Amino acid sequence: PTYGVGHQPYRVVVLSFELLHAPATVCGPKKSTNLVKNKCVNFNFNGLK
């Protein structure tokens, strides 16, 4: 603690991801709903909005 700022121990954590090029496992708090057919709609399958 006698050392000034910039010398204190700092805990650092890094998070890695890949984006949409593989079957996703971790998803957000979003809620699903039933699909539709033969209708002009917009969809959010796993992220591909």
Partner: protein, 50 residues
């Protein structure tokens, strides 16, 4: 630092709010995604290092 740890995170629900809103995390800066866009997208191959 020379013997850092690698961890696997999978099959879990993404709740970055309970980490973003936590007091001690004074630096929340990301590179490939926006800091506030985490909750809107699904992830896999998720790893963390300490």
């Amino acid at each position: 630092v020379y013997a850092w740890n690698r961890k696997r995170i999978s099959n879990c629900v993404a709740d970055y709010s309970v980490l973003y809103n936590l007091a001690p995390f004074f630096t929340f800066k990301c590179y490939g995604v926006s800091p506030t866009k985490l909750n809107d997208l699904c992830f896999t191959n998720v790893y963390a290092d300490s």
